[PDB]
Structures are given as C-alpha cells and as structure tokens.
C-alpha cells in the first residue's frame, strides 16, 4: 500500500476512519491539535470502496486516548490491521472492523499519542504511533 | 502480588529474570544505566521459589532493546505473564517461559526502555515500561 506519515503534533481532536465488518480497516484520517489549532491531517484512503465511515470526535483537551488496541490478521492473503479500538478517559470507541487474528494493545499510563504513520493498500497494512508527554 | 516501580533511568545494562516451563515468569531484576554507571535495580522476587534464572547481559551502550513481547495466560487460577522475549538491535533473548495464552508485544521505532514497573506474586502479574529519548 501507500506509506503515510502525518508527523507529530500537540494532541488529537478527531479520528475519521472506515472499516468493513467482514474484512479490515480501510480509510484513516486524523484531525490533530497543533498548538491549539485544529490540524487537518491528509485523508489516507484505501485503494477500494465499500467501507463504513465513523467519526470519533473527541472533547479535546479534557478527553484523550488511553489505549489503542485491535487485531492484525489475514485478508486476501495480506497481514493487515483488522480492527481498532480507541479507549479514552471518557469512553470506548469501537471495535471497528473484525475482532479476529492476533490481539495487540498499547495502554498508556503517562503521556499522549501525538501522531500516526503506517501504510494503507486495500486495507490498513500496519501503523505506528508518535508518543509525547 | 507485591507492586513494584523501579522508576526511570538512563538505559538498561542487564536483565535478570527467572522462569519455569510448567508455569510462568517468576523473578525480575534490572541492572540500569544511570548517567553512564551501572545501578543495580531492586530484585523483585516471587512469593515462591524453584525457578530457573537467566541473565541477559547487553553490550551497553551499543546494544538496546527494540521489542518486548510475550504471552499472558492462566496458571493455577492466576492470570500472569507466562513468557517474555527481548529483542535487541543485536539478538533475540528468549522466549523464556510457556508461549501459550494471549500474545502481547511492544515494538519500538524510536526511543528507549528506561524503566520497569509492575506486580509480582507467585508469578509476574503485569508490567509497564518507562520510555524516553
């Protein structure tokens, strides 16, 4: 798929993703914070259509992500990110996608996710997270 | 378990843990770096004994941990870390323990493990890691 790297920012305002309840995560886009202004990150699009969009509008700055978790697994013979779950100090959003394959989770006791990078082809292939205090 | 918290240091020189094939991870002790000097961490020991010790001696400073992984599962009613694996830029150490249960992994693109906290009872219940540039 096509690599992206949004970089690091100050915080997260909103996450906009798409998913299919029989396959994987599709589209992925983030509205970050940047020193108090919304920073509209680029829309990282799946090569294919048929996904269901969801808007995770966080109550920034009092609301912030405490755990990202999900599953990785095979779809059409690629290892992809099959489901995501975003738990903040205020509520849980997801799982979105298919909760099958290998679990993974990044709980955070201290600090903030401030950035995403990764790769999207037909589905979200892999991703990483920038962390900061 | 008895909760522990080493806090944050400059880097890791050495890991001493113990495990039992039948059960899970027992003891855990880290020799940290502190401003270019070894600092021997508190030895966090199981309520019970009978484990097989190992020592993971890193070539500090040029060797560092890039990924921690393992498995959690239920041993005699206790949900615990049943194995651990430590991958550096140089080699993989482990797996130590039973590699059955739910997987976990923390991989690192940028930055260092500088600290460990958690809880040890009969086995290692859980742990967290301090991360720094």
């Amino acid at each position: 798929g096509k690599a992206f790297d949004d970089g690091a920012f100050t915080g997260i305002r909103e996450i906009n993703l798409s998913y299919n309840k029989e396959t994987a995560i599709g589209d992925f886009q983030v509205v970050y914070d940047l020193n108090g202004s919304p920073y509209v990150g680029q829309n990282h699009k799946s090569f294919i259509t048929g996904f269901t969009p969801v808007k995770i509008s966080l109550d920034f700055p009092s609301e912030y992500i405490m755990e990202v978790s999900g599953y990785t697994g095979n779809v059409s013979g690629y290892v992809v990110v099959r489901s995501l779950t975003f738990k903040t100090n205020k509520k849980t959003y997801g799982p979105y996608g298919v909760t099958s394959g290998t679990p993974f989770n990044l709980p955070i006791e201290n600090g903030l996710i401030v950035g995403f990078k990764g790769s999207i082809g037909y589905w979200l292939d892999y991703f990483s997270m920038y962390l900061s205090l | 378990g008895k909760a522990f918290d080493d806090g944050a240091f400059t880097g890791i020189r050495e890991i001493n843990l113990s495990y039992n094939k039948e059960t899970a991870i027992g003891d855990f002790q880290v020799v940290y770096d502190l401003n270019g000097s070894p600092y021997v961490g508190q030895n966090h020991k199981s309520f019970i004994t009978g484990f097989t010790p190992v020592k993971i001696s890193l070539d500090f400073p040029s060797e560092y941990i890039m990924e921690v992984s393992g498995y959690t599962g239920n041993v005699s009613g206790y949900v615990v870390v049943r194995s651990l694996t430590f991958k550096t830029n140089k080699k993989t150490y482990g797996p130590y323990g039973v590699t059955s249960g739910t997987p976990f992994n923390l991989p690192i693109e940028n930055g260092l493990i500088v600290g460990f906290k958690g809880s040890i009872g009969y086995w290692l219940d859980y742990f967290s890691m301090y991360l720094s540039l």
Partner: peptide, 15 residues
C-alpha cells in the same frame, strides 16, 4: 541535527 525527535512505538500489522 535541527530536526526535533519523538518516541515512536510500533508498527503493528504487516512486517
């Protein structure tokens, strides 16, 4: 360098 650095954890998914 004059490029600021950040902790990055990951990736999860395809190797």
């Amino acid at each position: 360098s004059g490029i600021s650095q950040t902790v990055i954890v990951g990736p999860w998914g395809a190797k």
